[PDB]
Symmetry: D2
């Protein structure tokens, strides 16, 4: 019979009058039905979280939460085929992606923040005063309260646990709404929380959509303590306006239009391997993927020729096969949007070096949401498809001649999430990568994520940083305790 | 023959079609005419800021900006009497306040952030990979761009430099708008920037109001790169909505309804000395002042007797007298708001232990904005005057019996700026202070501000922390550079 | 039919031409035969260590060593009863000590340094230069090489793993020599290293003595890369002289004559509970124990009455009974030294408030190394038994009148390991504890050890600090890599 | 009349029965006479330091010491021609060296440690206990006591203030013994301390030699609190044995036999500029200079040809002339030692590519201690002049073929002070520099000293690190204050 993905509030599974289907983009089938949460249940979740902070969870030590985070990760690992299966059904992710990136990084988030919490120090200074007095200043970290987590469909488990792990490390309760397209791993995560014994109310799961549904409810609730959100920058704007009511802290990661910069002195074979991922991993649906590619003129033709052949060899096929490298897009609706941008490219005059259409398989997969890996060329830096985030398996490639030129062009965007630079020149690597106006600037690699380091986006691509202590300070209330130490009295 | 406070944009002093008066609350007289920036001038300032980053200022090293910050501080110090005179005229502050708190701390903000900048490290980790490869991760700090700074009237110079100093340390340009009530020290700050040679467009000053004036224009400008604001929380809400269009970073410090907790084992004399300041410094118009005072029952009557006697001795008088301890409120409008809260207290049934009215001098000061230091008692934790920020020289005082009780009652607010706890008991001091839901929790002191420590407000009282590296991180764009180091091929 | 404790060198168990007995101080009987390493075997161990760094261990990442440390900890935990039995037999420790302190803390050292390693950052600064150039500075941490570890008998497993865990975290090989009195848990540690697959030569174990034995051979080896030692300060002197030939890094923790300071406002019951441990835990053979106790005069008589009554209830008995609180001393020789100090006290005129002799059981335990918990009083701060470390279950107790007095008297020693201060007064607690000239200054507790914090001794009590990053820095070679980044040419 | 360089003890200038001459190596003249301190006066200095800690200095706040350090630096700057003059007379340093390195870095030491002290935080952790208790741990920094400073002749002011500035930052008193060859700037530093008002006993200056004189006295004194020493590693061994008596903390920087590694892909012109300094700055008398130079085979001949011409252009002349680049060695005795090594090189079979002798000027300079900048070649890695520290203006240059080879050869020494690597290859720069077994590994530069970073030597080249907080923690006694916070009692 057909899987139910239910809500999880205050330790209880909760079904709904209103439901909706979970469709797999592999072939357009239904793989589960999902129970939507009304304004009332979200209210129930927020109140259950605040009540949890009045119980066992509110009395946990940091050390106990370290252990909880590790028990969560261990149970996820024990159930990792379950997580893998659900993630692949919801998204169409190839096994090569889900089993090496999504599920392992999703588990590692909990282990990494357990380590960070275990060693987190106390921020402290001593203030000298006159007359031999002094003050000791030390920052006490408390939970914010109940953190609202609105999670995207492109990396469902990974970006969910990227928020949930530090939020729980800091002793918060969470109210989590996964994307309507990707409810599965979030529901399995709730099963894990229940299995290891996380107190009820600590982890709450509400399903639905954004506008006029669970996401809007969370963002508007006056008793939410913070809102974390990854996704469309325009939706970030909407969430921030709702957070304005109670001046709620917000932490945003908001997509982008990221540049790759390839110099003639690069290690060409490593660069091609890396750029095939930066362009087409997850069918180009990573917020960090490149969609603007600048290639130094003397290797531009070689690049285009070799990249077109590499694309021909890219296996776009059954996602469950171990050597498939690209699956469908997330949904028919997103496919429609990406194909509309393929058409805009045509209209703007683009040359198609690869792709530009839809694979035909001759079976049920043709009712799924597939698109070809695509490369365009020939346009100015001002064309719409060169500037506007497409979020599909596509880039525009253009030659450049000088370092000063390519920095200016790379930074000519209102976004600023990520960049990837390829050169073997020592000084140029460091010079160029640091001048990229982005949160993460990779050199001779792409999508290497050190969870201890600051990560986020500039401009329209985000607000704030997470990673390491940047996460622990965001999901914490800091109270500077300032204790005056008096001289002994007569 | 009337002082003019002009705008300062891209290195030029700019007069305006719209003007308004700066009035002193000492006697209601006019101190200066202020030139209100229009939207075009604010646009010009933002554009001048971005242009400055393409020039000399955008090429500065950290060490050069360390020197700039110190040069700014030195010139301010050379001109400290001018800053003092302007601050006192705009605000009514007593000499005892302005010459020990506002001007010294305002200068110190620049020197402190110079030190912090000089020693700021690079945040860095090594990531090990398979195959003997590894990646070096290091965070490069760059300016955000043009930081909009909207400054309050209660500590005009101090809170302005609290933002401007770290913003400049990080290499930003700024567009600053001081309160319409207190334009003076900000205009003098612009003079200092010009005098020490800060490049044009790095420091821009636009005068005016909030709505349909310079405050809104800065808030909404699509090319502002961050907004930092101190003042009323609901204005914070509005600014945040404006910032949402471009998901601009915001840093907010937004007042509160702060608790004092006085245990019977406190050092009574030190506590009274500190509490007179926590209640009445700056006429209760420090955002960190206590307006809810919880006193352990065994010393409640003693506290009330001693506090009333101390208030009778508090010198509410000519602010220029070195003796004076309280001046007027900032403005007639704010005085009206505070007296309306005094009257709301009388309607809610309060007992007045001190004050509740207006001093009468029998001279022109009676045209100013004066109010008595006031202590009320006898009300519920639920009464409006006990929960709503008044921002005047008033507290409601009430007894408590247990530690767990007073922690609950202290934390029973939607605010969370500050607390001050008085006890000589070691474990109680640490246990209670840490459980305050506030940004700053003082024990046996009040309003001691270590510029290296995290400072900010919880709940309605703010967003983010500043101080030390918390400031340099907020006013900087962080780019994590991640360099894969391949094994030899 | 007799247990053998062998050497473990380059992955092989090695027996020896020279052997000695491990005796239990409970009843003087033989627990095991120990195989003493000769100079050739120590040389082989050092060479095996350097060879290991050219192999698998030298290729490990930090994350792999994090996992190794945790695997070591897990296997120790699986075998915790064996470690317990061996530690208790070698030492006479009561179950109440060994099962709550020695074995749990010994396992925790590995897990703690695994955490610290996992999150260790890279120390880094940017240096700005003229001409738009700059330099990136980042410190690369590498192993030192082969760390010699010479371990004491009072906490054999705990202090061994305190050194071995950070040394391995940093990628070193080790050559360890446990005390000749307490070879057991170190030999079991070698079994754990072998069982979890630590590469051969990474962990080497050599048994024996100091002079003309393995301790000296390690100390003097020209290819040792660092020496870490805990024990008698004058042995520290000798080791340091040996290390001088190759200017080898040394890290030392060297005992002391630690002060306790008890103010009249202390929580009397908590203080007595803590002080019974600070005096008599491990029969006073923790290097951190108090042997000088200063008690504020108004509670001196109460302290002495209550302390004597508590000592009468202290169970000095079969160590395997879950009830027992004190076992024998480590050895007959150490017992002889402590009783000679008891007699020196009687010659210096001391009043004995408790103890001063030897318990009599009327069975084989009388052949062991037992001593009574002992409290003396009535002497000058200058008497020999008041200044010289006894390292047994004894303190001299004396009244004081003022805070400045007791700070002076507490600090009147050439040692400086630890202090324990008892007071409920907030300012006094912080003021007095910070002025102790010691590595660790406890307030209202004793022997609480946060493995992330700096720990060590001042004066004769040590050199350096360990704990947290202080350990990873000591057991690592730091190479500051300084990379000039030129403007484009 | 002739300058007197007196002792400075407890605020008083102190002369001596026993004196000795300060000879300038420019022409062998006398430029001052120096008053030697006996065991008694050193005892007086140590006791005056401990007494100073019982007075005003012992009550200074960190903030006050920040200001003192800056007042010292400002007075040094005001008197910088005085410092320059004394340093150049004692050493023969060219103006180009003393006015750009010695005096400016000597002053900057005080300003840099003032900044580090001003922002130094408190190391702190929170320990959770059972039953809702916890402990606050915070490290309190106190002075060690009286720090003994034994300072070398090669960088007299710079290495003196490198120790004195952090020692005073940490609130210690100091007893300072400058090299018998270089008493001047140390005596001027005492004048500065007196001028700005440093309390008497805080800064004490004793003159003399090492064995059976002031240096040995300081190192043996039972009441010295720490010993800092830069110089000959064998003397470090002697000092460490004397420190063993009271297990005194020691911080050592002990010379070396440093390698330069030059790859064929280097920026050749920048490398030559940098290597001329690494070889011949201060006439090769910097502990950090290169004496073993490995050049990748394809550029070995070009390197030798160009370097020989550059040496010909190196101005070895009157040190007071603004474009002189090399002065004499420090003394006739050191000159004798360096020339003995030139002779050992001859005997070992070396080819001399440049120098190898003594300049002849035809005037009084010929009674000074001059030697030619020298380059040898042709020897094995095992020859004595290739392995033994010469500490003069000389290197041995040899070709290499592979990266693995040159790392092994560079690290084949019992020293490990410094290295300098020249390449434009990104990955190779980072790979090779990090594997150097040294305290400081420079890439495409040499002798760039960030005073916030850890600095020291490996192996025979030192013990410990200094720079930044590494200095502040060495010259401080750390007391971890651990405060148990109990639950409220019934």
């Amino acid at each position: 019979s057909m899987k139910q993905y239910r809500n999880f509030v205050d330790g209880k599974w909760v079904e709904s009058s209103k439901t909706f289907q979970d469709v797999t983009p592999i072939d357009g089938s239904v793989v589960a039905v999902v129970h939507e949460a009304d304004r009332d249940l979200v209210d129930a979740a927020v109140k259950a979280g605040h009540r949890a902070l009045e119980g066992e969870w509110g009395r946990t030590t940091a050390a106990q939460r370290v252990d909880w985070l590790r028990r969560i990760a261990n149970e996820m690992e024990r159930r990792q085929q379950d997580f893998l299966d659900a993630e692949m059904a919801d998204t169409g992710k190839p096994l090569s992606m889900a089993a090496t990136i999504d599920i392992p990084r999703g588990i590692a988030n909990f282990r990494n923040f357990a380590d960070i919490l275990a060693t987190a120090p106390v921020d402290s200074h001593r203030l000298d005063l006159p007359d031999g007095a002094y003050a000791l200043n030390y920052a006490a970290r408390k939970p914010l309260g109940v953190v609202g987590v609105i999670s995207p469909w492109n990396l469902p488990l990974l970006l969910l646990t990227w928020k949930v792990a530090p939020a729980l490390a800091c002793g918060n309760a969470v109210v989590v709404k996964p994307s309507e397209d990707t409810p599965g791993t979030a529901t399995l995560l709730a099963e894990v929380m229940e299995a290891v014994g996380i107190p009820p109310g600590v982890f709450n799961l509400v399903h639905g959509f954004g506008p006029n549904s669970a996401g809007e409810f969370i963002s508007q609730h006056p008793d939410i303590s913070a809102i974390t959100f990854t996704g469309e920058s325009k939706t970030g704007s909407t969430i921030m306006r709702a957070a304005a009511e109670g001046v709620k802290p917000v932490s945003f990661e908001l997509g982008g239009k990221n540049a790759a910069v390839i110099f003639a002195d690069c290690d060409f074979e490593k660069m091609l391997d890396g750029m095939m991922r930066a362009l087409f991993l997850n069918s180009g649906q990573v917020c960090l993927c490149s969609e603007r590619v600048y290639v130094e003129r003397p290797i531009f033709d070689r690049f285009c020729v070799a990249l077109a052949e590499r694309i021909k060899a890219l296996k776009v096929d059954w996602p469950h096969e171990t050597d498939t490298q690209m699956g469908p897009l997330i949904s028919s609706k997103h496919r429609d949007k990406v194909l509309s941008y393929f058409e805009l490219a045509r209209q703007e005059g683009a040359t198609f070096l690869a792709g530009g259409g839809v694979p035909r398989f001759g079976d049920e997969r043709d009712n799924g949401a597939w698109v070809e890996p695509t490369v365009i060329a020939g346009l100015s830096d001002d064309a719409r498809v060169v500037r506007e985030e497409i979020f599909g398996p596509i880039c525009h490639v253009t030659p450049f001649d000088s370092e000063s030129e390519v920095i200016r062009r790379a930074n000519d965007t209102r976004y600023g999430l990520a960049a990837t630079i390829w050169t073997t020149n020592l000084s140029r690597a460091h010079r160029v990568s640091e001048l990229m106006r982005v949160g993460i600037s990779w050199v001779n690699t792409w999508f290497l994520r050190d969870l201890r380091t600051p990560f986020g986006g500039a401009g329209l691509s985000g607000i704030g940083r997470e990673g390491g202590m940047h996460s622990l300070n965001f999901y914490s209330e800091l109270t500077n305790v300032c204790v005056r130490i008096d001289k002994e009295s007569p």
